[PDB]
Structure formats: C-alpha cells, structure tokens
Design an enzyme around this catalytic site. Structure first.
Site, PDB file in Angstrom:
ATOM      1  N   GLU A  15       0.683   6.424  11.746  1.00  0.00           N
ATOM      2  CA  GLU A  15       1.630   5.926  10.826  1.00  0.00           C
ATOM      3  C   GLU A  15       2.678   5.194  11.582  1.00  0.00           C
ATOM      4  O   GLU A  15       2.914   5.467  12.749  1.00  0.00           O
ATOM      5  N   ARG A  16       3.250   4.125  11.001  1.00  0.00           N
ATOM      6  CA  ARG A  16       4.173   3.335  11.755  1.00  0.00           C
ATOM      7  C   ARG A  16       5.376   4.153  11.918  1.00  0.00           C
ATOM      8  O   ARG A  16       5.787   4.817  10.981  1.00  0.00           O
TER       9      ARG A  16
ATOM     10  N   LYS B 152       0.888  -1.107   0.000  1.00  0.00           N
ATOM     11  CA  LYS B 152       0.000   0.000   0.000  1.00  0.00           C
ATOM     12  C   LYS B 152       0.894   1.115   0.000  1.00  0.00           C
ATOM     13  O   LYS B 152       0.864   2.026  -0.803  1.00  0.00           O
TER      14      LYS B 152
END
Lengths: 167, 487, 58, 466, 66, 467
Positions: F180-181, F154
């Site tokens: 968000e990571r 993605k």
C-alpha cells in the site's frame, strides 16, 4: 542425514565438496594425516597412464575403470579406506579433478591453519599459521627475492600511472 | 590486504564472478583495478556476482577487485545545486567538484506515516494548465507522461523556471531543489538542457543528475536511487525538493536487460516484476514529510514515455497505480498545433485540490469546472456534431480558455498572471474575442496589468485568495483594458 | 576583428602547455622509468612501508 | 598472446588463449590464417579463454590453432584516402585499387564523447534541397533517418546530397554499406564513379564506401558501421569535418547485432532484440555528434521492419532521430525530383521556439497550405477549382507552384530530371516559396517553378514561357 | 612518502631545465611543433581570417533601401 | 541452530545451518541484525542450508554471518491491541506508539477451515449502492474481490465504502495494506485519527491497520497480508467478530509471490507467475471464511495487472471469490464514478431465489439491456443509427440513462468530484430501474441520472437539467 564437521576448506569448489567429505571423514578419526599425505603420494603416482588415457579415457569402460583403480587405488594402500571415494569419483568421472580435491583437502588441514600473501607487495612466501603478516614481515625483511614483479611492487602500477592519471 | 583485494574470478558481460570478497558487506560497492565500481549484489558462496558498474571490455579475469568495503551512498548535498552530475554524483560538467562531500545512502527508506505528513501544500509550476488542473502540493508523486519532444521536457523547464522565482524568493517552501534525473538522455539533449538552465540560472538550486544515452545500465539504474537519496536530504532539511525522474522507462529496460544478463528472468513485457519493487521503493521515498523533517518534501514528478501512446502497458499501469495522478501530454494537439499538447482528460491529479493555492482556487474552482463543462462539451460536443447557444459559449469560451492553457515553450507564468488571464474568461469577457485573439489579448492585457495593476496583481497574490475588491478591480481593469486591447 | 587576433595566440599557448604536458609526460615517463630496480631501496622503502603495514596495519 | 582454438562453434571461436589474456575487444589475427581472420574478444570466460568472434570464415580450421592476439581491437587503415575508396568491413580494399593506403589505423570502436567535448549547440546543416531544409531542418552532427523509396534515385539523391552539401559546404562523406547486396553496391560503385562523388581519379574523392554486405558473417556486418564510425570520427575531429555518414542501414545492423546476441548465447532482449540494443545504440548515437571539431552528420538508411517501428528499436531510434527523412514514392510518382515526401520531412527539432518560428511558420503556413490545398485536394478531386474561393484557387496554384518550386533538377541525371541540377542556398530557397506566399507569382506558369534552383530560376523559367 | 616523492623529484628536475631553456626548453621535440601547426590551423578556421596579424582591414557596410 | 550466510542472492538468504534444520517457516534471527531479522525458512535446500527469505534491512552482511534460528516462525501480537495500531508484518507498531502488546502471538500461517465451518450459505448484504448491490449483491463473511486498475478512484471507491460501511459496521475491521502506498496510508491515517474511528482513546477501534507498504521487501509485502489475516483470524474466531477485511491490494501479495518465484529456483510461471499462486491462494482465501465464530468479510483490492485479467492471477482469483467487482476502464473513462465494469461486477449470489426476483430480474433486464446495447456498439461505432430501430434506441438510451444513473456521486471525494455522493437505499434502486425500464424516464435529460443515487433525485435533477 549425518551430523558432521566441514572445517576450513569449506569453500565448496565441488572438489571442496569433495574435500569436505574427508573434511569430515579424514578429519574425524584423524586419518587426516594419513590421507593428507596419501594424497601427496597419489597425485603424481597417478597422472601418467595410471590417470591419463590409459585410465581417464572413457573408452576404458567404467567398470573396468574401477577395476584398474580397484586395480590403481586398490592398487594402492594410499587409500586404505579412502579409496572408495576414489573408486566412486572414478565412476563419477572426477579423476582429472582430483588435484583440486587434493589441494582443497590438504589445504583443508594445511589451509586449515595457514596464511598466504594477498598483499599489495611481492610475496608468495606463504605461511602455516593463522596469526601472521607480522612474522612474515621479518622474512620479507630478511630475504630478498621473488619475481619482484611477484606481488605489488607498487611502482609501475600504482605510482606508475599517477602523473598520467592526473594528466 | 588479504581480502581487501580479490581477484576477478571470471569476467564477461559485467558480471564479475569474484574471487575473494566474502567478508564483504552485503550491497557493498566494490572497487576494481580499472577503478570501476561494481556492487557485490549477489553473494553466492562461491563468488560474488558483482554487478559491474559501468561499461567495459576494460577488465580481464583475475583483475583485482578490491573491496571498497562500502555500501552505496551517493554524494549528497545542496552543493549539487549548481551542479550537473553523472549518476555517481561526479561531474561531467567538469566545473571542478561539487561540495557534496557529504554522502547519503541510496539505501535509505520511505517515511513512516508518522514521519510523513500528508500534502496540503501548494507548489505551482507557473504553468496555467498544470497549476490549474493539476495544482501541485509537495511530496507528491505525479506522473508526467508525455513524449519525445512534445516539448516533453520544455514544460519541465518552465516548471523549474517558475521555481526560480522562489529560489529568488526566500520562501524555501515555495523554493524547490530541482533534481532532474536524466535517464538515457543523450548528451546533446542534455547539453541543451543544461545550457537552458544555465541561462535560466535556476541551476543554482538545481541538481541535474544525468545518465545520458550511452551510460551503463546499472548506472542509469542506480541514478534514480541516487536521486532518491539526494532530495530526501533537502527534505529532512525541511526543504522541498523536486525530483524529476525522466525516465524510468529506460531504467526498466536497462534493468531487465541487466536481469536477463543475470539470467534472472522476467515476465510481462519481458520485464521482471520487481521492476515494480524497484520503482515502488524508489517512489515511496517521495514524500511530504512530517514536521520532524522540517516538513520537507521531496516531490516527485516522475516522467513516463508512452510507446505508441500505450499505458495499458504493464510498466505504465504500474506507475499510474503508484502515482497520485498523471499528466497526459497528447502530442496530436501538438501537430494540430497546440503548445502544450495534452490529454487533459487524462491529466488528473487525484490529489488535485489537496495540492492547491487559494488565489487560483477562486477562479480555478470555476475554471476546472468550466473547462470541465467545456470538456464535457469536448465530450458532449466537439465532434463534427454538437451545439446550442449554451454550449456554444462553453465551446467558444472553451476554445478561448484552451488558448490560455496554451503556453509557449521556455516560459512559465506567475500565478497572479494566470489567475488574471483566466479571470477574464471565467466571467466571460473574451468570448467576445475569437479564440485567435485571446493570446494577443492575454499578452497585452498582461503587460498592461503588470504595468498598472501590479497594484492589483501584487495584491491578489498578497491576499493569496482573491476578493471582490480584486475582482471588481480586475473587472474594470480587464473589461476596459479589454476594450483597450481590442479597441 | 581584434579579438580573433588575440584568441589565436592564446589558444596556441594553451595548447602548447598541454602539448608540453603530453610530450613532457611521455618524455619524463620515458626518461625516469629505468634504474628503478638499481635502487633496490625502492623495494626496501616498500619493505619499509610493508613492515610498517604488516606492523602498522594491525 | 596466442590462443588456440578450443571451440569453433561457427564463427564464434572460443579461444583459449594460452599465453596471458588479452582484454575484451582485443582484435586477434589468427595465426596460420593468411586470411585476415579476425576474432574479437567478447568474454573472458575464465581459464584465459575467451569467447571471441570470427567474423570471417572458419574454413578448415584445425583446432588448437594458433591465433595471435593483435592485443587490441582493430587497426584499420583510416585516413583521408578512405574518401573515394571501397573497403570492406576489414578496411581491406574491395576497391582492389590496392590497399586503401593510409597512415593512421583505427580501432573500429570509438567513444561517446564527454559533455564538454561537444559543440553543445546544434545548428542546422543545410542540404540545399529546398524541401529538405525547409521541412526537415538538418542538424550538424545529427542522425537523420532515411525511410525512403527503393532506388528511386535513392542513391542518386544521396549522391546529389553529397554534392549539395559536402561539396558546397566543404563537407566530407562516408558511406557505410551494412548488409547490402554486393551487386547493388557494385552498381553503386559505378554510380559513384558516375556521380563523381567518387572519382576513379581520387582515392580521396569524397566518399568512403565501407561495406559489410550480407554475405559477411554477422560480426563483420555488425562492425562495419562502427568501423566506419571510427573513420568518420577521425574525419570529424581531426579532419575537423562535417562528415556525412551515410549509413545503410541500421536496421540491418540491428538485425545483425541481435543475430549474434542469440548466437552468442546472449539473451537478446525483447522481441528478440539484443539486450544492449539501447546501449550499443547509446554509445553509437553518442559516438555521433558535433564536437569542438567537426560534425558527423549522419544519414541513416532505415529499413522499416514491418513498416512498423513500435518495435522498440525504431521507437528508440526516433529518440535518436532529430530530423527524419521519408522519401515519397507519391512525390516520386508525380515525377518530382525531389521525390521527397515533404509533409513528412520533419525534424523533432521542428518548433518555432526551436527551429525558429520563421522556418517553422513559413513552413507552417506552407505545410498547412499544402495540406490545405490537400484538404481541398480532396474536394477538388471531385469538384474542381471553380466553386472554390479564389483564395483556394490561389492556394492551389501557389501550392502547386510551390510544389513545382520544390521540384529541383538534378545534375548527373540529365536522364531522370531532364537537366543538370541546381543548388538552392537556403536563404533564397525558402525566401522563394515565401515569395509564392506573397503570391507575387500568381500570374505565371507554375511548372516553371518545376525543377529549378533559387526562386529566381523559377521566376525566370516562367518568363521564357510568359 | 619518499618512494612516492622519489618519482616527483625526477620529474620536477626535468621541468626546471626545460622551462629554463624556453628557446629550446630542453626537448622542444620536433614532433611538438608538428602538432602545433595542426592545431593552429583549426583555430584559424573557427575564428575567421585576416590580412594582417595586428590591425587588419575595414570597410563601411552601407545600408540599402528599396 | 545457527546459520551462516552462505549466500545472499537477493534478499533470499541462503543460510547454511549446519547442524540445525528447524522446520520450514521457521523464523531465523540474524545475529547482528538489528533490523529485526527474520528469515523465513522456505526450503531445506539440503546441506541444512535453507533457503530463507530475509524480510528486513540487509546490507553489511558478510557471507558466514551468524544467524540464530528462532526455531519457529514469527510470533506477532495477535488480538485486540492492534486496533488503532498500524502494524507491520512482524507485528510491530508502525503507528509508532510504543509497542503493541496483544499477548497472544502468532505464527501467521493457518489452514483452510472446515467445510462445515465454512460458509455453506450466506446472505446478501446491502451496501446501499445501487450498482453495487444490484449486480454484485454481497455475502456476509465472504471474499469479495475488487478488480480494478491503478489509482482509479479505486482507492476512492474503497474509501467511500469504508466510509459508508466500516463506519456503519460496528465490528472490527482489519485493514491489511499489501504494497500500500505509504502516502495513501498517510492520508488515510490522518483521516483515521480524524475520522475518530481510529481514535486512540480506543486501541479497540473498529479498525486495525496493518500496512505493508510497497517500499518493503517483496517478501515482507507478501507476508504482511498473512499478518493481517492472522490478526483477523484472531478477530473472527477469537473475537467472534464480523470482520471487514480491507485488503489493498491482494494483487501485490501475489505479485510478490510470482516475483520471487524465479529466484527461488522456481520457475516464474506463465507471465512470469508464481506456480505457487494457487496454493497461495488456496491457503489464503481458504483461510478466510465465515466461521461460525465470526465472519471475515473480505474486501480485496485486486489490481488488474496491466489490465489483463486473463492474466493467470486474476484468472485464478475468481474461484476464491464470491463477488467480483470488476471496474471498467471505459466506465471509469466516461468519468462515471461508479466507474464499474458492471458486466463483471457480480456476485454469484445474484439470483431471484436469494435476492428476490425483483432485484434479480430487474437486474437481468438491465444486464440484458446493456448487453443488447453492447451488441450494437460495434456497428454503431462507425455507423451511427437508423440502421437500427428506435426501440433499440430506446434501450440504448435507457441503458444510457441507467449508465448515468450508476453514476452516483462521491461524498467522500468532493475533492475529486465536488459532488456530494449518494447512498441509495435499495428500493430507490430497484424501483429506479423499474421506472426507467418502465419508460418513466425516457424523455428526461440523461445527465439527470448522471451522478445521482436515488432515482427521485434524478428526477429532481432532471427538472433543473430540463432547465
């Protein structure tokens, strides 16, 4: 909505919410003392038929209930204007519930400058000062009594388990 | 002592409505008369909704809840290495105590990006399959997804076993603190597991945080967080720690249950969605740190259990979106035989090549692809319907190679061996062999090269990156050996 | 064949040390548990430490 | 302490205990209740009022009525005398062989042991059923779960199993009838008598039947397993035994548990099921084990909800299942005693590394062979033996022989099987099928292998024939 | 301090008489012996049997061929 | 005024302000909270007690604890000093490079602009990715949502876009990292420096990073989005900029909303939802537009929760979109990267009118072709062919070629692919399909189209695949 003061007690046991009405109301104008004492009268003035099922009894019909306080609290000048909450709480069914308010309140100008043991040793001496646990230990160290079982007696309990607790 | 005691305002169902304790710290773990802990999670104005930590019936109203006055930390240190603990970081082993009288907050956070440095690391598990297709770096979150003894665990053991050697090495960087967080893992299972580790005595660099099956839900709940702190320690001490969370599936369950019991509600799969927050927060702390932390890591190998193989499953989907690839283990292959049993196709480390080791990379580049092609022919072919000679080889070859990623339980490999056994096939030397003879070959071939060509092998490791020389050496070694293996 | 011999003895003595612990634990707890209050001075030593709490706590 | 009925909402009696306050799970006996109308404490509601559960009738209960806290959970008679005896949930005699007279009493709960306490290595309990051991290797102290035909000599088999192990190995058994039909249990009684696993001559026979049939209020059914567990733990540890705990039927249990979850106003988790489903299980399954003392090797009847089991409980249960038992109607239909589905008799502890590669392999060769034979069966079903390779013919014959060899006559049941039954010491047993794997016999009547015991008895039966 | 140690004294004393009376270590306690016999038995099961307490008996297991 | 912690019930800190009652949204400062502790007023619960949300580290807290109301919302730096910078919600360098000084500060709440100021019209903007433009032709300054599940490349894909575009694109871009990571930002970060689009020789990079990682308090995660928006509003309106607003992932914003909803004493709607989803959306998406100052062309990662789109959240979303990229788990699963669900990677702005009919038609022919093909699948699935005509086969095959042709390698993720990926200038696409459709490709090996961009190359690739 009304800018006000809800001083010690507080806590809002609902009857703390109630207390807080007079914890701003009695408290202001300082018909604190009037009422603080009023309550004292009332509680036990109350709790018999002028409380019980000759009152509290819903089967009294609410309007009539007013008109038996307002015949019970405009039955008493012990609520010369703090009656009204009575006659409200009355309606609002909080009649058996008054002790908690009363306490909370009464406490809210007593427990509104006190202290109580809460301690890992005996007492229930209680106190009416904010600074404390210094003074009291001179009344403790003085008088010997209480249930002894009353507060911690750090013996059967702690200590008592302990060898066991090692094994 | 006034509010350093409180009275259990009311209790049932591990939700201790707590009288007093208002002066409380937020997130204070508190102490019961039963010696049990709770956390005053919710400070309501009236009481403290205390998630009571543990399982009870062992309490009653008005019981004293005494502040402990402390926000949770969990005992931390390297002295949990060589230790199996319960979630609180206490023994269950009963080997006396830990040494981890340092404690470190479960409430500690994920690095800033500046505090973090991306993965480029190697880290191999000794597992051909793994190291090949999902070669590992460090810091990484990677989902191990696999099921109820698919040897689901077996694999992890082998991974750990592989790390033994580094921990027997002096290369910390290749050493790993292994943290096996056991959620729901019944005692028997654990008993074996631990036992295994003992035997492998990799235990020495290893924590096993164990919240077995019976364990209270918060405990199990907490356990990851506990784990979450602990590896970060190692990590700030530049060390590369490995946490295995096996498994959060149970945690979530517990948590939800917990929530529900808190009357706190949910959504999807009956779970409340901040089960994500739970995991996210849990998982962000997995990192490969910047240099400031000794470049440490806490590499997270989370584990997720597929109920009915399902992943579309909200919680699985979630975890996937967090993880940096997923390792699908596919059990059918297990019934089908196959040790290990994998959907390789799903097994991906998106990180992948960032997590590599050049030695392997030399064969692995080709291999991932040849298997890719093989897979491509798993897909193109490998129905009851597809062949030409080209592909027939890929298939043949493939099938052979499959055996090489096949891999017994309680047994990982050294990388050079992996490259080796693989090498033969890469350059197509054992397609000559049936799939069936590969393992035999492999075994033999391996003990042979170990015996003689440790020269070579050692060397291949040494240059850490094959070379034509090695290749050539291998090539004769193998071919001829192969000739020897056979004939 | 030898070891089995020895281990039986050990195991009794080991268990006997624990049984003496359990019986001693019950017995010592059943012996010493009585005249505690007859020392009122065990609530004096509480009062002791309690005035040294209520002093030595502030 | 005394409590008063403050609320009766069904057999959940919310009791205000007036005096003191007795901890959760304190078993209370209601005073004025001649009926052993037990309440179990569940929550301390505040105001020394607990919500507790009657698991017994609420017959005419005038409120405020005094309930006397027994101050702890249950004491139930527990002792060796539970072998050969029928108690209901409350441990009373529904044997009506007077009370089941024991010395020891028990709280029907018992714990999940500590890590240290265990026999930490789990080693096969042998069933003596060829098929069984082979295909599902049974573990000492484990939970084995019985999916299984209905009364397909179910009970019989079970009885036979008791015979085979608990006799053979000097085992013990407990039968916990959770939510069954009193009638069927009645029947079972006679069966048990009949089987002689219960002797009417021994109130210490070999099996304790503990029953908490559907007719009980939930709590009773809910507890009846735990109760039993509690007995078995004595029996395990103390009586040192390898208890076989026949459990009928965790599903109904599961169901029962949840019933209260709702009605307890609890939220039973997903799909309706008790949120503590996992922990109740955890503790339960963890109550079960092999210790340093005995084993409670647990045989669990598993009603399979909707033949479905994705439904969380069994899925989880699968985790708690270690050796799995499916009894085959197909095999039963084939008249086979054992009626077992052999290709379902599995153990997740199956593995060459785990349950050893011989067991595993021998089995794999076999399981395969049967399957292969099956693969061929499909073919054969049409095509016959003829054009098949001889090897197939061999496998067919052997498979069949093996099949027949899996077939084992039963004792008590001169009636279904046609005989008295045989026990099959593992070592010979497997060795036997394997002997067929060496194909030694493949020149003989294969239905000589039918309904036998040791491999010899199969060869022998061939011999009288030819 | 004392209050806490005041318990330990009372225990420690009783031990002294007990251990300094090993034959009847003041309170062998009939119950103790009854438990002993129970636990002695189980260990025998775990550990196998034997004719004699010390040197037992022996027999030479002879291999066998087809 | 001052408030007392009366309840911390989760990170919902119910603060009782006694004689204060600053309006909703007001950022309140917890006194003693070193963790720069904004409480955002959410409700006047009554009793001048407010429901607030704590948005920072919280623990230690005692009931009663003192809060000093900042009496207004958060002010966060807005404007240009954020480019380069990775800012948190509260507008604070989590790039960690000393402070961030964009002197214009903000309450991060804003309105829907006027309809007249709204896009009443927009234009197809080429991306140069075949599938992408073709099926989803994109409009400048609009909101494009990218539905797609978990880590499906993605990120890879977006990155690839970013790569192609944000690079290309001269304007500012805003990245608002919702949940968000940390890692993903890390990589990106390191890249960003690296890419030198972020270079810190320019805090007027073309990119402002706002990161609000999933470790954050949900409330915090929820709001980081607005933060990015507020800045971007700075950039649109103030900086007149063609902003690219990279959102990863709008789902988490929402997710946070829904997640909290219960606790707010609100009901967690269907699926648990935020009932305030819509309004959240309305306000959010409607805050975005093309003003005639700038355009905020919005790239919104939309996680498809648990792969349910029917799921109210995604269900809602569509309204606010202008182009949807729905990535197909199947396509993805075919390894095809582009991994699209092309049959819902769309733009309303597909139409011959707009995009010229050629595009359109070809696409419709394709859309169709797939569609028909789609139809068959159910039969064929068990039942193979020949119970079908061979023109059906042709379309099938073509659809398949096309399929492969959408597979168009990834230049970025050579790490994933090994491939170098393609950009397809539009004609090779339009033409491309016209040709396949023309049957011009219909005797080639299908893998020819597999992982190609420009169709010629597919031919080239064909030849070699044809040995």
């Amino acid at each position: 909505f009304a800018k006000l003061v809800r001083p010690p007690v507080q806590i809002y046991g609902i009857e703390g919410r109630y207390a807080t009405a007079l914890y701003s109301a009695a408290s202001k104008q300082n018909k604190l003392e009037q009422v603080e004492k009023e309550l004292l009268r009332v509680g036990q003035i109350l709790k018999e038929p002028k409380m019980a099922a000759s009152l509290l009894n819903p089967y009294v019909k609410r309007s009539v209930k007013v008109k038996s306080l307002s015949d019970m609290t405009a039955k008493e000048k012990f609520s010369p204007l703090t009656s009204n909450l009575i006659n409200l709480l009355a309606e609002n069914g909080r009649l058996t519930n008054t002790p908690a308010v009363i306490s909370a309140f009464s406490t809210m100008m007593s427990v509104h400058r006190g202290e109580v043991p809460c301690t890992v040793t005996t007492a229930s001496a209680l106190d009416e000062t904010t600074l404390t646990e210094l003074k009291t230990v001179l009344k403790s160290f003085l008088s010997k009594g209480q249930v002894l079982k009353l507060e911690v007696k750090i013996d059967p309990s702690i200590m008592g388990g302990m060898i066991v607790r090692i094994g | 002592d006034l509010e350093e005691t409180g009275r259990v305002l009311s209790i049932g169902d591990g939700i201790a409505r707590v009288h007093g304790l208002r002066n409380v710290q937020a997130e204070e773990m508190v102490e019961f008369s039963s010696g049990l802990k709770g956390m005053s999670l919710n400070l309501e104005p009236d009481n403290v909704g205390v998630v009571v930590f543990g399982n009870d019936k062992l309490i009653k109203e008005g019981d004293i809840v005494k502040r402990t006055g402390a926000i949770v930390d969990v005992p931390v240190g390297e002295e949990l290495l060589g230790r199996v603990v319960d979630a609180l970081g206490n023994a269950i082993d009963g080997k006396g105590p830990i040494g981890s009288k340092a404690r470190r907050r479960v409430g500690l956070k994920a690095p800033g990006i500046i505090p973090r440095i991306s993965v480029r690391e190697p880290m191999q598990t000794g597992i051909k399959a793994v190291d090949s297709l999902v070669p590992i770096g460090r810091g990484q979150r990677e989902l191990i997804i696999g099921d109820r003894q698919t040897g689901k665990t077996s694999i992890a053991i082998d991974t750990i076993i592989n790390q033994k050697r580094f921990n027997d090495g002096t290369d910390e960087k290749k050493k790993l603190y292994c943290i096996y967080v056991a959620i729901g893992q019944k005692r028997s299972t654990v008993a074996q597991l631990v036992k295994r580790l003992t035997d492998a005595d990799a235990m020495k660099y290893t924590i096993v945080v164990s919240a077995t099956a019976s364990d209270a839900a918060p405990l199990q709940y907490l356990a990851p967080y506990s784990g979450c702190s602990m590896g970060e320690y190692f990590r700030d001490n530049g060390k590369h720690a490995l946490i295995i969370y096996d498994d959060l599936s149970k945690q979530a369950v517990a948590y939800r249950q917990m929530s529900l019991l808190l009357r706190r509600p949910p959504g999807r799969e009956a779970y409340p969605g901040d089960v994500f927050y739970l995991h996210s927060r849990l998982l962000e702390r997995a990192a490969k740190m910047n240099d400031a932390f000794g470049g440490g890591s806490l590499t997270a190998l989370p584990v997720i259990e597929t109920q009915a193989g399902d992943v579309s499953a909200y919680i699985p989907t979630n975890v996937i979106s967090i993880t940096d690839g997923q390792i699908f283990l596919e059990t059918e292959l297990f019934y089908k035989g196959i040790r290990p049993a994998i959907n390789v196709g799903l097994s991906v480390s998106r990180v992948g090549s960032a997590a590599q080791t050049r030695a392997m990379k030399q064969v692995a580049g080709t291999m991932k692809l040849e298997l890719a092609q093989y897979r491509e022919v798993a897909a193109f072919a490998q129905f009851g319907s597809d062949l030409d000679a080209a592909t027939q080889q890929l298939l043949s070859r493939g099938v052979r190679l499959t055996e090489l990623l096949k891999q017994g339980q309680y047994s990982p490999m050294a990388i050079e061996e992996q490259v080796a056994v693989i090498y033969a096939g890469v350059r197509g030397y054992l397609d000559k062999l049936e799939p069936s003879k590969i393992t035999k070959f492999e075994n033999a071939f391996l003990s042979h090269v170990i015996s003689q060509h440790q020269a070579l092998l050692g060397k291949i490791r040494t240059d850490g990156k094959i070379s034509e020389e090695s290749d050539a050496k291998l090539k004769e070694i193998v071919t001829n050996f192969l000739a020897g293996f056979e004939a | 064949e030898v070891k089995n011999r020895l281990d039986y003895h050990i195991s009794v003595q080991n268990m006997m040390r624990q049984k003496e612990q359990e019986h001693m634990i019950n017995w010592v707890e059943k012996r010493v548990v009585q005249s505690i209050s007859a020392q009122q001075e065990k609530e004096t030593i509480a009062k002791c430490i309690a005035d040294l709490k209520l002093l030595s706590k502030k | 302490t005394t409590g008063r009925i403050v609320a009766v909402i069904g057999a959940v009696v919310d009791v205000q205990f007036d005096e003191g306050l007795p901890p959760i799970l304190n078993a209370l006996e209601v005073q004025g209740r001649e009926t052993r109308l037990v309440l179990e404490v569940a929550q301390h509601l505040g105001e020394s009022t607990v919500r507790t559960i009657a698991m017994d009738g609420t017959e005419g209960l005038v409120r405020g009525q005094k309930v006397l806290d027994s101050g702890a959970p249950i004491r139930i008679p527990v002792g060796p005398e539970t072998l050969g005896r029928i108690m209901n949930v409350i441990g009373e005699p529904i044997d009506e062989r007077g009370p089941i007279k024991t010395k020891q009493f028990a709280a029907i709960h018992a714990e999940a042991p500590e890590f240290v306490e265990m026999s930490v290595e789990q080693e096969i309990l042998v069933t003596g059923i060829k098929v069984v051991d082979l295909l599902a290797p049974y573990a000492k102290g484990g939970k084995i779960g019985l999916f299984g035909g209905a009364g397909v000599g179910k009970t019989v088999l079970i009885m036979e199993l008791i015979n085979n192990v608990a006799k053979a190995h000097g085992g013990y058994s407990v039968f916990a009838g959770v939510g069954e039909r009193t009638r069927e249990g009645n029947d079972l009684y006679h069966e048990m008598i009949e089987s002689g696993v219960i002797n009417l001559k021994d109130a210490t026979s070999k099996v304790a039947l503990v029953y908490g049939q559907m007719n009980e209020p939930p709590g009773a059914r809910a507890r009846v397993a735990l109760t039993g567990l509690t007995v078995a733990e004595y029996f395990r540890d103390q009586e040192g035994q390898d208890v076989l705990l026949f459990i009928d039927n965790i599903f109904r249990f599961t169901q029962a548990g949840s019933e209260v979850s709702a009605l307890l106003g609890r939220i039973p988790s997903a799909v309706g099921y008790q949120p503590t489903l996992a922990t109740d299980m955890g503790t339960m399954q963890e109550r079960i084990t092999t210790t340093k003392k005995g084993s409670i090797t647990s045989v669990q009847a598993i009603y399979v909800p909707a033949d479905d089991l994705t439904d969380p409980a069994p899925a989880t249960t699968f985790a708690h299942l270690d050796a799995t038992t499916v009894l085959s109607r197909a095999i039963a239909e084939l008249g086979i005693y054992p009626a077992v589905d052999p290709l379902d008799s599995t153990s997740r502890i199956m593995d060459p590394n785990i349950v050893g590669s011989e067991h595993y392999d021998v089995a794999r060769g076999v399981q395969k062979i049967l399957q292969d034979y099956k693969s061929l069966q499909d073919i054969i079903a049409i095509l016959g033996m003829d054009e098949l390779s001889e090897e197939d013919k061999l496998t067919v014959s052997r498979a069949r022989k093996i099949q027949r060899f899996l077939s084992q006559p039963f004792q008590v049941a001169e009636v279904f099987t046609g005989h008295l039954g045989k026990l099959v010491p593992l070592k010979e047993t497997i060795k036997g099928f394997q002997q067929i794997l060496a194909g030694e016999y493949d020149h003989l009547p294969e239905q000589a292998f039918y309904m036998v015991g040791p491999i010899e008895e199969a060869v022998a039966k061939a011999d009288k024939l030819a | 301090l004392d209050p806490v140690q005041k318990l330990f004294v009372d225990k420690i004393r009783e031990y002294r008489t007990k251990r300094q009376t090993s034959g009847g270590p003041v309170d062998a306690g009939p119950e103790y012996q009854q438990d002993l016999d129970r636990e002695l038995f189980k260990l025998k099961q775990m550990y196998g049997k034997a004719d004699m307490n010390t040197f037992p008996n022996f027999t030479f297991e002879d291999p066998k061929f087809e």
